[model samples]
Target: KCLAEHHEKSKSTHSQVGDDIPKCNLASGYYEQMQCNTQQHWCVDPESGTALGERRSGGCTEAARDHC
Candidate 1:
């Protein structure tokens, strides 16, 4: 997986409802998007595992979904 590198550096410190990790879109087999504290959303490159776009504020759900 795409999160192999992240796991190497990070471990499960605690079990909570808020684990900030990039979700996967199994349909295409790629990162779906990353949600930062529920407000900021980042779209990931569908082809590659690269993150895309800027830190859009005030809820930019429309744009991120379009890219993903």
Candidate 2:
């Protein structure tokens, strides 16, 4: 019974984390948009906007190097 309860709690927590990742069109720019997404978590210009990319992990630092 305790194990079952724990499993349910864990599942709930996992779902919450997954749902926490927001879905929106990040404007094209070089800035830190926190809590952007789960996989591609960064908000980089042109690379992000309506899609996900490597900058998600690299952040603006990578965006500046690549774009600027």
**Best candidate per TM-score, number?**
1
- Residues 1-68, candidate 1: write the lDDT tens digits: 64553454456554334335555545654565443336566666665556677666555566566652
Question: How well is each residue in 1-68 modelled by candidate 2, as lDDT tens digits?
Answer: 32344446658756423324333333422233333433344433344534334443354435534641
lDDT of each: 0.54, 0.39
Clashes of each: 0, 2
- What ranges in model 2 sit over 4 Å off? 1-14, 23-33, 44-68
Model 1 earns a TM-score of: 0.42
Model 2 residue 19 distance off true place after TM-score fit, in angstroms: 5.5
How high is each candidate's TM-score?
0.42, 0.21
| RMSD value for candidate 2 | 11.3
